[PDB]
């Protein structure tokens, strides 16, 4: 009957900070290294687990959302469904990490279909960028099967763009173009002056300009006549419904215009008829400014780069250049870890292959008589040799056809190639093996 | 008044045919904005279960936002005939695609997806056999989907209503017969063939470059053997077709044009009644 | 623009025949062969799916109930949650097919804990009875991954007891004792006069008697004094909440008794004190009859055996004897399937093994010179031999350690043993192989 | 009146110890009815979230069924002291298990789980050191869980309340701090060592025959190395312990007795207030 004296202080301070840990586990702030919110990370891990067998097999998004509970997710399946829907579609991401089949929405309508009808899979982008998954840090909580963060080649957080609201913090990173981010990371690897990555929204035919530290998202319009205008593009945050309701509905009510819907496959589009009540200035620039103002074709956005670093601590970056520098600095350590582990694996593989080739060579000519013996006796007489020390089980467990001449030559060539690969891994560094990997993404 | 979720065809109420779509869910019409012809492909999403309209009062028929929108979108006046038949005194018969067709001098005939007046056709020198009105087969005449029955003037702005829904239970015990109950307030629609149901493919093969669309499971087993390396994709809903496939389903559709027989008012009580 | 003429007749008709198909698949009536409700079968299939890796590993019931959607279940995880809970507990099942860890309830309280805390696994009862799973019929709907019905050795539907209400049909089968059902099937196997299986509720210390075709569930009671009584067992359908509220509460309100709670590990129990207001007759039988009436200690239950046969058609059985007589008839041909299939496998395995043993005898002495050749040449030089030809890929694709003396003898014995096994399957029938298998259940 | 879900100890209100349990959910009661001692192991399930009692007045706390039941089950009357202290004029000190214990002549001392009167203890010939009342450490005296503070008469029918909930978020942002606010209406309870929390193990090993109970994750890593072939079972809730394990947790519990300090009324506003 162990009666403790924990008081009310300890009870209340353990009831509290437990909610803090619970909300830290699922915090909307995206991790800097991998660019995943916790829900997105769990969805990606579940998709990888499903696609372990067949890489190109599409799985129902309902299955993906329901599988995250086994991995460690706590906030149900609706959040996983939303994360999968927002990650699969190409209208929301420059670098979609989930190839999707079904109705994931578009710019005109951003609502995805029901998760029980739409399919999803990990795309070739994920395998092109998200490498060295085996070396990702193990989560502190053993229940979290997905690692703490994956190890992408480039800072994915800058590619698809992340927006979220947290208690006391707000994150908003504009989606940057993949090519410019790759160039910036390549420059940071070699220590050159890194150019600021160009922000490019996905499936956006408009104009983006950087003014006084603010990004002005400008749409494009062309005039078909004196009183007829055809909008070709609109700012990103509008879909057809909200743009129509908030811009063209009141102006039509005001009687200024009688708009015509013309959105199609080529993004957005709006044919607008100008009435006599509306006043158009004869000057070109004044009319352009008025049109961009009233129609809401100019949008200003400010980046609030708050990301979780590799140590689990919330970090605020003034600009994306410092974030890229820190990301490359962190990724260099994991590249070095890959170098070391590859060196070890190649050394072991070469030793095993050389042992196999020499066993075959001894067999074919005259040396090791497997032709009648005891299995344990054969193991002892071929393990007394120092070179076949710890490889007896693999070396005896070889196949019959290896004793032919062609397979003997193949084994010798494989051993030589393993030696060459081990030498290549030994005589290479982080810069070379990172620049080589930064040449396959597209 | 103007309806928000009323992506509207340009030729709406312009004495031209339309194909107004009633798709379930605002998500499933996301393609429709991108795969319309921009001329006659009006659409209106509706998420939910439309209230039964058989025995339902006219008072809250206009109160229901979904039900009032359809009348507002179609420009229909409840309790009034949608069409106005043009009277006639001639009858003709002709062969079309190996089938005998009974038509009137004031009717419209659809050939290759285009409707042509009988008067214009008779000038094209194809054989028309005049018959007496007493020898006309009313049952066969009313069951022809290639004949339009002498429309003089129409209050509709949308000519046709192409109902489009899923194939699973989200449509079966759902909207699928429910709107037919509401549209039964104008029986002239079904005999005319204006109310249509777009058939969603259930199983789609992946042979070679193109694909094979199998609208029923029975059709799948009968043609499975002649499918070279077929890959199966159960389309249990609208939100399972890619953008290209939905484009083909719209520009080259197949319609289950429902028709209203003399038993029609009895079945509406048997189910949902 | 293929305009069809489907009319409204089929529209209403196809609205039906699919709701019925939506109902024919979720019929609460248990299948006769396996004893599984549709909700119950998917849970077992999901539990079997998770147990492929580690058979004794307990899985969270949420994971088990959350995977049925992938297998083909339509009614969500809430229905599959209850079926998993009602399987594992031993208070509700005489022959529990799921071994459960956690709070699955008891007779006193029949509510199981939350599905996210309790664990479940397929029990040792399942593998002892549910054999020949590979030969189970494939479901007509290809989406339904679980087979149409499993193939248990004994009619499990009679063991755990099944109750359910459907549109126009109801099912209620009393749980029959496992030992008696095994005896009944054995008699039916030999065609003898099958004894009616004895109904025995799980964890029931009361008395069950069969009167006029009705099963009277009698509880047991013993008197501690003239005015003090101690109930030791009560009818099955009462839990502690329903018994106290419906029976003991109003009688306490009426002032007849002042009951005392004595429920413990040894099932139920109630110490009841008799007041002066209550009248007790001096006749032992009259007191015995009166007590069992007001206290609700006697319950009458009528079996309504409605089960789905092997053809998917609802069937009504007058008594359990007819079900068992029909059950063994259906199970006999599936055993015959095993006999036919085992003959093919054993015959194929022997020829592969006999030829495999003959590589050694040729290799070790002087015949097949694998010692230096081309791999493609080696196969052709032995594919000419008719015996070696049929399994050329396996026969060469063989471990090196097969070439030693001790493993050479082991290969020869294994090939010789397979002939005895193949002969054993050839000269055996259903009766021998269904009585031998009907000796491992306990 | 009689409460339905009131599995009741035989010695309820009989001047004897009781250990009434407040377990969340009726399912967790599933073992309790089977693993009680039938003498002092009362219990009452409570499923849901107990309402905050720090802004809602005394007269209306009887309105809530869960709140009314606890008062009815425990016999507590709102607005009055739960006990009655017997006055005293003596003080003594002694050593127990290597710890100095400050006791009064009219207090109760717990040894090996059994409470013995100080007068009886002084007859057992073990050393008591008398001290003046001015030299008594009030803070140390009030923080002793082996000392009961001079109870004369009690209106309680249940001597102690043993709160027992889960360990996951269904236990953290849940019942646990909520009843402590309700039980704060009688501050004498916590100083008396009556409001108690049962510590449910979080991780349990499977070494050999028996098992090792690890109440915190911190105690797991520090003792993982000395665990021969340990199997891990995360008990994230009451409904995850087998019947035998729950029996041990009841007959030989580890009690987290809550003691309220002078700061007690401020924190109930900072959380849930």
From Swiss-Prot, chains A, C:
SMART domains with a match to the protein in the record: TOP4c
Cofactor (UniProt): Mg(2+)
GO cellular component term, pick one: protein-containing complex
UniProt GO MF annotations: ATP binding; DNA binding; DNA topoisomerase type II (double strand cut, ATP-hydrolyzing) activity
Positions of the catalytic residues: 117
GO BP, one annotated term: sister chromatid segregation
Domain Topo IIA-type catalytic residue range list: 29-438
Listed InterPro entries: DNA_Topoisomerase_II, Topo_IIA-like_dom_sf, Topo_IIA_A/C_ab, Topo_IIA_A_a_sf, Topo_IIA_dom_A, TopoII_euk
Quaternary assembly: Part of the DNA topoisomerase complex made of gp39, gp52 and gp60.
Protein's name according to its UniProt entry: DNA topoisomerase medium subunit
The organism of origin for this protein: Enterobacteria phage T4
Originating gene: 52
